[PDB]
Amino acid sequence: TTFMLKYDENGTITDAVDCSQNPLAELKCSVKSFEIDKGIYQTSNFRVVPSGDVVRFPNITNLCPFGEVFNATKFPSVYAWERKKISNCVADYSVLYNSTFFSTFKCYGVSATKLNDLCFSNVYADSFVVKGDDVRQIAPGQTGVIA
Amino acid sequence: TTFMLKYDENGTITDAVDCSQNPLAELKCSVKSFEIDKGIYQTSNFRVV
Amino acid sequence: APATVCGPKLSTDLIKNQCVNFNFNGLTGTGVLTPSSKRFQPFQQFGRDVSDFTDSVRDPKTSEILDISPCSFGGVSVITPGTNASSEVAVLYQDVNCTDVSTAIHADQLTPAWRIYSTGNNVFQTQAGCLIGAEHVDTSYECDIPIGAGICASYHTKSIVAYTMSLGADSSIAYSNNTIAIPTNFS
Amino acid sequence: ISITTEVMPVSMAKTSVDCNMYICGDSTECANLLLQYGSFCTQLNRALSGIAAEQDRNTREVFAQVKQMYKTPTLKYFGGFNFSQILPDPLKPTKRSFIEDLLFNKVTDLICAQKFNGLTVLPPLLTDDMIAAYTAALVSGTATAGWTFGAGAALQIPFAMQMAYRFNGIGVTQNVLYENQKQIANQFNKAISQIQESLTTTSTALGKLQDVVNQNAQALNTLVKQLSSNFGAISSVLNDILSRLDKVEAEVQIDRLITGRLQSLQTYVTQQLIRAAEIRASANLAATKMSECVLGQSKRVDFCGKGYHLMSFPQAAPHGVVFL
Amino acid sequence: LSSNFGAISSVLNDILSRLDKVEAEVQIDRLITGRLQSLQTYVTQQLIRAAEIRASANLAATKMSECVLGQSKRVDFCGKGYHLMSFPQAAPHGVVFLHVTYVPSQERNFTTAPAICHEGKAYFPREGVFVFNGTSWFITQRNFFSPQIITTDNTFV
Amino acid sequence: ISITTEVMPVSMAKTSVDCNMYICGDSTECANLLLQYGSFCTQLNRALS
């Protein structure tokens, strides 16, 4: 709890005010005084939240679309990359993330820990295989290489 | 192009404004209205190279 | 769009009740979640304010139209007589509404969270806020501590009195065809 | 004898922006980062709480000018002079003048729904009923008593004898009233009926006040559009940044967004202090005009009226005073 | 000064004694630009407040010129009632005036008219009211019952 | 009869400023970078206009 202490001139804590004890005691922590003049002041705090609704879309509730991508065999070339549309599949990136299969996981735009929670409208696995010098170079910007 | 849109109280777009149509329409996109009273207004920059 | 790639979270059901941590497809926050009458073409599933807020969403399971009013924030203004004159208990605003806060001080729904608070019993409602603590008396003396929209607080019966404002005093002077009034003594 | 609408703005909206709710709508993951800026809340919320308490002090400087208050006289016809400006009781359900009825239209239990932005408007501490109650007695006492009315208690004077001192206050002799007392009375009642026609249409009592009505409510409309801004963050919405950015990478993206939104209040709360310092200077002017054009006759010229000044009348207005 | 403007700690010599001059520069330049913004906040608060005091000093200077050095005829600028004089008293960072006012008190319900009773065309007073007490007409100054005999020098046609 | 000057300032220099020319006039990548701030093109220019 926020808690006002009155140190003395000599250095002894002689008195104190608990902040959330009274609204009168709330005022004393605001104006930093014990002798409040007659009037009207502020503390401006309000309104905590009881409940939570986490309602989201699917009634169909399919699962794990990208198991047929990463564990799938054929990946085409750089320029001939395939775009795969995913529809109505509840993805679990937490299964994807904690299993360390990947060298570069430059999770741009979002972050993997909070990627499990939110929803989307389409994901597109764009898959292609490059020479290792261009792995860092597939990023926003990085336009210098030919890949 | 910068492009103003009026949404109705219902919700269907009733009218739109191209910003670079005429210098009347630079103003409407600047002050965010259709009905302009009178006077003198702003939207500045000049001179491509 | 119609939200396609979701997460493993289970979907609860909506309530009209205030201050719900709503999570309509990654759109977190809180607020009153009352249904309303808005058009919502099927290619628009997320409505906004006059300037850029999560205002109205479609419930993606039940396809229902509902808008969000946020949780009832505002200032809190305590009203005191002088502590050397009276350390008697303060009376307070809550800058929203009577019934929204009086039904939210029956349990821990506010977060100033005063420990010992023997209130409300004298809960008024004014134009400015709600003004919990003070006793509304229909007499009218003179504005001591200004409240808002023509009412003022003071320290009378000793309690704290949320009287509406009196304007000076009433004076009865008669306009007449003939009568002038000149003074004799002067201070 | 011409009467003149002069319009002084005396107050503005008692705005009290909620610094926490403006910068970060409810998310205590943010409010730790705003807590380590120390005192840019609570010095924000004091610097325009000091405005809002002062915005009633302006209205108490102007109207709370006579001590005791005066009931509306019934026989409004005062020795030739019509007085349709003095709050008719049986006709009007509302308690305000008929000219004042023409004023509140020509601008712009009501509770605000408290939008996501964090803004609110405190109500003015003097209601429009009470402000019209003042301009009842300010018009009534000036018509009935007039002189020690301003100096102290009321000393009643028949209105022709009161005006004859005001002609004597010009310099023109007391004879010149009663020589033309009917012709003076008709020019007075003609001049008011122009005001019930001129400011019906031409938007003048709009004009000076609608500057205060717009510009104070227009800087709110700039302040709410700063929430839509990006400020070098990823998403303009504060809830999106907490929802998808690790809360250690968010503390870059939130902190780039707080310093924008906190600076947009210091842009706003500075300009509200300066507009308050203009309106206070306009209220201190109006507190002298109701002192010196209403409670008495002023001889310092082109200050009250635009000629040799006989008398004046307050009329209530939304956040303003219309003098006649 | 005891803020934390995106830094480790605002005790500024602690930042120099922990982070060594190449990573400290991140922890100080963010700490400066929040601290330097607090001065620009403060000086803006002082410029506006000086404008409010200069407006109150220019108002007090006109009271010093008019309520003190002369007698202001315009009402309720110096005093409350009719104004006689004022005594300026010094005050810490201010001026307290002592506005000596008149404020006439004891009123009398009298009766008057300008249409006086005389065979010739009626008269009008020079600073008078044509007051009438019991069975006698007089003229007085408007703010004091000083009953003068209605004569030629008081009136005109 | 002593006549006395009394000097009274009534106006100052009506100074405007192009906000976008002040911040970065030549660069349009910076003008893209300045665009993601608030209405400081407008409100800063409207304030001293």
Residue numbers in the entry:
A (entry chain C): 260 to 406
B (entry chain A): 260 to 308
C (entry chain C): 506 to 662, 672 to 701
D (entry chain A): 702 to 809, 830 to 1045
E (entry chain C): 948 to 1104
F (entry chain B): 702 to 750
What does the report in the manuscript say about this coordinate set?
The key determinant of host specificity is the envelope-located trimeric spike (S) glycoprotein, which can be further cleaved by host proteases into an N-terminal S1 subunit and a membrane-bound C-terminal S2 region. In the S1 subunit, the receptor binding domain (RBD, also called the C terminal domain, CTD) is localized in the C-terminal region, spanning ∼200 amino acids, and structural studies have revealed that the RBD consists of two subdomains: the core and external subdomains. For both MERS-CoV and SARS-CoV S proteins, the S2 subunit is mainly composed of α-helices and forms the stem region of the S protein. Here we present high-resolution structures of the trimeric MERS-CoV and SARS-CoV S proteins in its pre-fusion conformation by single particle cryo-electron microscopy (cryo-EM).
